[PDB]
Scaffold this active site. Structure first.
Site, PDB file in Angstrom:
ATOM      1  CG  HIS A 202      37.394 -12.858 -33.606  1.00 25.76           C
ATOM      2  ND1 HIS A 202      35.840 -12.531 -33.243  1.00 25.76           N
ATOM      3  CD2 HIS A 202      37.254 -12.153 -35.016  1.00 25.76           C
ATOM      4  CE1 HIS A 202      35.036 -11.744 -34.223  1.00 25.76           C
ATOM      5  NE2 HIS A 202      35.977 -11.284 -34.922  1.00 25.76           N
ATOM      6  N   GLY A 203      37.455 -15.630 -35.936  1.00 28.13           N
ATOM      7  CA  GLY A 203      37.595 -15.376 -37.219  1.00 28.13           C
ATOM      8  C   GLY A 203      36.853 -14.346 -37.878  1.00 28.13           C
ATOM      9  CB  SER A 204      36.974 -11.325 -39.160  1.00 28.93           C
ATOM     10  OG  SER A 204      35.851 -10.704 -39.658  1.00 28.93           O
ATOM     11  N   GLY A 211      40.807  -3.094 -40.853  1.00 30.09           N
ATOM     12  CA  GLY A 211      39.775  -2.482 -39.528  1.00 30.09           C
ATOM     13  C   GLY A 211      40.202  -3.149 -38.202  1.00 30.09           C
ATOM     14  NE  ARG A 218      35.730  -0.958 -35.150  1.00 27.25           N
ATOM     15  CZ  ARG A 218      35.531  -0.334 -36.257  1.00 27.25           C
ATOM     16  NH1 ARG A 218      35.386   0.971 -36.132  1.00 27.25           N
ATOM     17  NH2 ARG A 218      35.321  -1.213 -37.493  1.00 27.25           N
ATOM     18  CB  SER A 244      37.084 -19.124 -34.898  1.00 31.00           C
ATOM     19  OG  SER A 244      36.672 -18.752 -33.671  1.00 31.00           O
ATOM     20  CE1 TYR A 247      29.997 -16.226 -37.665  1.00 28.08           C
ATOM     21  CE2 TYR A 247      31.172 -17.938 -36.506  1.00 28.08           C
ATOM     22  CZ  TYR A 247      29.886 -17.371 -36.612  1.00 28.08           C
ATOM     23  OH  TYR A 247      28.701 -17.518 -35.965  1.00 28.08           O
ATOM     24  CD  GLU A 328      28.106 -18.743 -30.110  1.00 29.30           C
ATOM     25  OE1 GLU A 328      27.502 -17.634 -29.961  1.00 29.30           O
ATOM     26  OE2 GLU A 328      27.801 -19.502 -31.243  1.00 29.30           O
TER      27      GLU A 328
HETATM   28  O1  7U3 Z   1      35.272 -16.417 -34.493  1.00 26.79           O
HETATM   29  C1  7U3 Z   1      34.023 -15.917 -34.638  1.00 26.79           C
HETATM   30  N1  7U3 Z   1      33.913 -14.678 -35.630  1.00 26.79           N
HETATM   31  N2  7U3 Z   1      32.675 -14.074 -35.477  1.00 26.79           N
HETATM   32  C2  7U3 Z   1      31.629 -14.456 -35.064  1.00 26.79           C
HETATM   33  O2  7U3 Z   1      30.382 -13.692 -35.100  1.00 26.79           O
HETATM   34  C3  7U3 Z   1      30.192 -12.666 -36.053  1.00 26.79           C
HETATM   35  C4  7U3 Z   1      28.933 -12.223 -35.925  1.00 26.79           C
HETATM   36  C5  7U3 Z   1      28.542 -11.388 -34.851  1.00 26.79           C
HETATM   37  C6  7U3 Z   1      28.293 -12.517 -33.770  1.00 26.79           C
HETATM   38  N3  7U3 Z   1      27.073 -13.306 -34.509  1.00 26.79           N
HETATM   39  C7  7U3 Z   1      27.540 -13.361 -35.971  1.00 26.79           C
HETATM   40  C8  7U3 Z   1      31.535 -15.448 -34.188  1.00 26.79           C
HETATM   41  C9  7U3 Z   1      30.570 -15.939 -33.392  1.00 26.79           C
HETATM   42  C10 7U3 Z   1      30.628 -17.076 -32.400  1.00 26.79           C
HETATM   43  C11 7U3 Z   1      31.911 -17.589 -32.248  1.00 26.79           C
HETATM   44  F1  7U3 Z   1      32.027 -18.510 -31.418  1.00 26.79           F
HETATM   45  C12 7U3 Z   1      32.844 -17.267 -33.197  1.00 26.79           C
HETATM   46  C13 7U3 Z   1      32.927 -16.385 -33.856  1.00 26.79           C
END
Ligand code: 7U3
Length: 351
Positions: A202-204, A211, A218, A244, A247, A328
């Protein structure tokens, strides 16, 4: 101040995630007007109300004109001020406009959390604010040793799962952290022995991480438009690091990103090839798997503390008419995730 005995990498992580100026920069990136909606005036009820209006805009576009749309679009801009001067802002008239604004609101929620942690709390000059801010995360953060077995496995995951179609950059792992969000293991207990537990990415963006570490990953609130997310309102993961990593929203001004590895309890996957904006799973299913054309070679799955790590190089899945180039994974209950690692990444942009 006393000067802080946290390891240097943990201190640099705390500095990055609580950086007020990165918060402002993320907001200006969304074309928010900081004069009208500054960082400190941001609040949960205003974001929630914006989410609702965006749901109204969703409603209008589903059922079709630019006249009755204008009003709904303007009402969004009333609640979240955008920087368009003496303007006329662009019309929010399609699904792309809705996805894009709902993703902005997701991020503003995490920025509000981060800033409330900074502004709540006590002020004491003889403590190192790095220590003060660390504690607000309610997360144990340790540096993983470069020569450990876990380090080797993580770096291999990173090494083997960079997609050819994301070749505009590559990644080097700078720091690996082992993380334990307070109470999260306890929350996860019902799922801890479930089949199909997988270590996934999970990338953000970096400005979300305060958060994420205080509240965990969340689900978007009831007010948010379920149509703004391809598989509806869940928590999204990849088995390919580069999917990921995109993102993180890194580039050539802000080169370092943050990425998570969580143990995700997938159990019975509801396998899908196209957009399905669900708010609940079919009975008997515990997750969604968006079916990629390419998948980590299943034969190369390896185990790390009893969890499958799908770190094989990408091969054909055999799935035919899918919307997705890569897998995904989506869960719909926050308790099905247990965050395990945090990596600090350098992106080398080849272009
Ligand atoms: O690593 C991930 N981080 N965040 C993703 O999505 C963030 C937004 C909420 C889901 N669609 C865009 C996201 C969506 C698909 C995925 F395979 C990885 C990621």
């Amino acid at each position: 101040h006393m000067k802080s005995k946290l390891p240097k990498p943990v201190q640099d992580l705390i500095k990055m995630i609580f950086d007020v100026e990165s918060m402002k920069k993320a907001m200006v990136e969304y074309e928010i007007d900081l004069q009208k909606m500054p960082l400190g005036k941001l609040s949960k009820r205003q974001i929630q109300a914006a989410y609702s209006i965006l749901s109204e805009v969703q409603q209008a576009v589903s059922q079709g004109s630019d006249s009755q749309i204008l009003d709904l679009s303007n009402r969004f801009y009333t609640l979240i001020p955008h920087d368009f001067g003496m303007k006329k802002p662009p019309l929010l008239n399609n699904a792309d406009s809705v996805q894009a604004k709902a993703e902005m609101l997701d991020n503003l929620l995490d920025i509000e959390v981060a800033y409330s942690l900074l502004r709540g709390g006590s002020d004491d000059s003889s403590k190192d604010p790095i220590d003060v801010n660390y504690e607000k995360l309610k997360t144990d953060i340790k540096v993983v040793d470069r020569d450990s077995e876990e380090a080797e496995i993580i770096r291999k995951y990173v090494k083997n799962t960079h997609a050819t179609t994301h070749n505009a950059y590559d990644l080097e792992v700078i720091d690996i952290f082992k993380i334990e969000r307070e109470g999260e293991c306890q929350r996860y207990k019902p799922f801890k022995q479930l089949h199909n537990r997988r270590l996934l990415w999970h990338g953000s963006r970096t400005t979300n991480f305060a958060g994420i570490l205080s509240q965990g990953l969340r689900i978007a609130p009831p007010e948010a438009p379920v149509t703004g997310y391809m598989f509806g309102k869940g928590i999204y993961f990849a088995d390919m690091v580069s999917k990921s990593a995109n993102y993180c929203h890194t580039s050539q001004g802000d080169p370092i990103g943050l990425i998570l590895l969580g143990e995700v309890a997938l159990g019975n996957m509801y396998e899908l090839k196209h957009a399905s904006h669900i708010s609940k799973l079919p009975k008997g299913k515990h997750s969604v798997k968006g079916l990629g054309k390419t998948t980590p070679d299943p034969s190369a799955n390896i185990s790390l503390d009893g969890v499958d790590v799908p770190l094989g190089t990408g091969i054909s899945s055999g799935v035919n008419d899918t919307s997705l180039l890569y897998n995904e994974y989506i869960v719909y209950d926050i308790a099905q995730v247990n965050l395990k690692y945090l990596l600090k990444l350098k992106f080398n942009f080849k272009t």
